[PDB]
Design a protein around this ligand. Structure first.
Ligand SMILES: [Ir+3]
Ligand SMILES: [Ir+3]
Ligand SMILES: [Ir+3]
Ligand SMILES: [Ir+3]
Lengths: 116, 287, 280, 116
């Protein structure tokens, strides 16, 4: 539930607005022109993952007990800060026959971040 | 002790920040929902606490009032039904009062502000695309500025801006042929015509438009097959690999030929197998 | 071509391995789902193809017959001839079993079947229809029948070896018995085969009222007029604005099981649940 | 929807059996005794991110298009192989009060992996 406040400096949900121009997608995407996709960045301690409340908390905790006890598979496993809850957005684009189409594209927007 | 980020439904503390701390030290930062926990437990307990207690027990909110609760523009502090500070949406309304309006999401908002309200609350991308009730056809839809009217597969109008600058090709392979019998220099040009007209035209096949009598004269690229329309006298290349997986979530259709097809997908199997174009007529079944 | 790893309900290729291959090269590893695309496309095409066609178009499935299919421990030609690796565990080798999941499985093999399906942990705890009381039980071997909150008989093993403990590792059982560790309470709870529950920490104190009980950890005390003993339970949870309303031991209908506790908490009297719904 | 069956080297799901003694949960967890938790492992190519069809695919392709141009924030960002779908499981255990409970804990098992 951690929106990135301003130097809390943890695995948090950052804001970013994608411009379809920049990506070279202004082309086949009719509307909108860009959106707030956001990204996940921050770090993953051992005390934030289990407490995070995310859908990864439990699992990341189990693996972590193993990572602490140095089990080879996990010894080299990372524990990244990634999106854990994503929400859909509507788009109006040209498909492949160049027809005007309106569809709900899923997980276009990063809603909740977490460690994992 | 331990200081936290939020209060889950339970009224509990989730999202731990600091350790071996004091209430005030934590309650110093003017963050709306930040709470304090009292007891110092082994981290494992914290864990179990999230299986068992669904969070951390004995959660002391750092804010019981609304003082210096900074929500940002558009959000104000509205004391509750239980008296907890909740930042509600409060955009600027009288600055742009004006009749019903149409949102870029296809839904009609009572007036502009009702829309802005809805933006703040759950959708950061919402804007007014055109005035009045959102309509189905481009007929009486007064689009603003340079925007033009256009509609989609389900027939919803949208005010949009059409790119009218397309480079000369420098290839005869970039050439495309439209269902409208027109030869287009690029997919850029085709789009430009699709937009200016406000309706999908569709690609017939790659290359120049040749004047075919039947699918014989048509060369389909991309593993696509030729489907013909005897009513209009034209050909088209289509993908014919779709499978039509089981589901009674099948909302059967009535095709161009008036034959109830199990599903749009099945409509297309048919057409593909028979080499004859089938588009969708009505919704339902073919009575 | 392009080798892919899955075929969808759609019929299109998802999950790219690497580009600039040949069909036979791809279908080399005897894997059921692997598929091939002849057209070579690297650009965004592949991406849009996801949105547009919900997968890459013109998927050439690698295996048309079960021929050459290692599922590892079953391949069955299914109805539309789409080779499908199915579940077939060694059965032959009795009794309508009760799965450790609280569900009655018709045969013992019916279980093994379900196990291979989606329940990687499934097993038989006790033979016969899953019962709701420890009454009848022949817990295989060592076990002790036990029961849960909604009454479902489970056959488990109990730890009897708990390290002899400290003056306050001690706990007071809702049975009124002072126990040395959570382990002994557990041990006694398991052996008894039913729930004992922790009353408060420290030795069992003989109290007339809750005034006589020092709850530890923010918890409060509730009197069980039912037994005439004290109990320490948490009193901070919030009964939120999906709620399945209840009927209490005070014979008062409470909206949420939670609201029952707000009251019990503010009254200093333990309110347990009688039934689901509304009193009456 | 990819199983590490072998040596592919792609972000695939690897089977992993979590024993509850190793972890030290053997005591409050009545049954089962352990479970297949699985974990995600694998390198995250790009051809695989937008082509994987995971919940993190559209987003990962957007960001990555910004990374192939060099936006500032994303230079040091690597698209990690993490869970995208987690199924829950039933356990018989002891609650804070040492009572016997059969509850359903969420997101215990990793069912799908994906780059993101
Ligand atoms: Ir945002
Ligand atoms: Ir229609
Ligand atoms: Ir598996
Ligand atoms: Ir413990």
């Amino acid at each position: 539930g951690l929106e990135c406040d301003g130097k809390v400096n943890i695995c948090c949900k950052k804001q970013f607005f994608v411009s379809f121009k920049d990506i070279g997608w202004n082309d086949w995407i009719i509307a909108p022109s860009g959106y707030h996709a956001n990204y996940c960045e921050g770090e993953c301690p051992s005390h934030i993952a289990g407490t995070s409340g995310s859908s990864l908390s439990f699992h990341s905790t189990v693996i972590n007990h193993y990572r602490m006890r140095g089990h080879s598979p996990f010894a080299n496993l990372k524990s990244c800060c990634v999106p854990t809850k994503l929400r859909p957005m509507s788009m109006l684009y040209y498909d492949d026959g160049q027809n005007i189409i309106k569809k709900d594209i899923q997980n276009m927007i990063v809603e909740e971040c977490g460690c994992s | 002790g331990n200081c936290w980020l939020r209060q889950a439904k339970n009224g509990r503390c989730q999202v731990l920040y600091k350790t071996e701390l004091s209430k005030e030290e934590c309650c110093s930062t003017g963050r709306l929902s930040t709470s304090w926990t009292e007891e110092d437990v082994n981290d494992n307990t914290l864990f179990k606490w999230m299986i068992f207690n669904g969070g951390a027990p004995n959660c002391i909110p750092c804010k019981e009032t609304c003082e210096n609760v900074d929500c940002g523009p558009g959000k104000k502090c509205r004391m509750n039904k239980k008296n907890k500070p909740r930042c509600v949406c409060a955009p600027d309304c009288s600055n742009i009062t004006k009749g019903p309006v149409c949102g870029l999401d296809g839904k009609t908002y009572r007036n502009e502000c009702a829309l802005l309200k809805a933006r703040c609350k759950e959708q950061p991308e919402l804007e007014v695309q055109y005035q009045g009730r959102c309509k189905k056809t481009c007929r009486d839809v007064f689009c603003p500025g340079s925007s033009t009217c256009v509609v989609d597969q389900t027939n919803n109008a949208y005010c949009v801006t059409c790119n009218r600058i397309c480079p000369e090709p420098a290839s005869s392979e970039q050439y495309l042929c439209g269902n409208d019998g027109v030869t287009y220099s690029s997919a850029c040009h085709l789009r430009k015509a699709t937009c200016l007209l406000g309706r999908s035209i569709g690609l017939a096949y790659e290359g120049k438009c040749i004047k075919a009598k039947s699918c014989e004269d048509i060369q389909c690229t991309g593993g696509k097959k030729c489907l013909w329309d005897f009513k209009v006298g034209r050909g088209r290349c289509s993908l014919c690999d779709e499978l039509c997986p089981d589901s009674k979530s099948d909302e059967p259709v009535c095709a161009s030929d008036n034959a109830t097809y199990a599903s749009e997908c099945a409509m297309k199997e048919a057409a593909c197998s028979s080499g004859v174009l089938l588009e969708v007529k009505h919704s339902g079944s073919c009575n």
